[PDB]
Symmetry: C2
Subunit: 94 residues, 2 copies
Amino acid sequence: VVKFMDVYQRSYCHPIETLVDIFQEYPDEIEYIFKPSCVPLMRCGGCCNDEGLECVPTEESNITMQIMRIKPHQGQHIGEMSFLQHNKCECRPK
Amino acid sequence: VVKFMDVYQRSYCHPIETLVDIFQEYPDEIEYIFKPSCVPLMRCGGCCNDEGLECVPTEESNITMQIMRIKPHQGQHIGEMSFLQHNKCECRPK
């Protein structure tokens, strides 16, 4: 049984590696098929213990990754794509 | 710049720590306010590279955690709640 305090600290609002789909990140590029289709990014997650508060980023950075993309029967390509990362989170009002 | 292979292995379907909301887990307990409102659980996530295959669990277990719950105007209660964990994932058809 995980003690209340472990669960409390571990789930509290903080940056956590999150597997994000590339389409949600670059939406004006659905006319391509990415591989991998998703990337591991550091994003604010978890909970604030108050309904009024929400977990949001207070410091960000960019990560560049080699992603493959292919237009329907038109050649395999490999390029760089940048994604926004969260280095620090904070519980604040909505 | 993260190399294509690093990104590919890291994002590929596997059990990863995910911060889940307790209501999502116990939709009947909407009557209570849990603290923490969310818990860290091992769940299948990531991607299968072929949108035909989907990342799903092939081995599970239960985790028990001490969670506090309170009814409006009543006292704080502390108890145990069990959540479903994923020990192994696998890419498969829909």
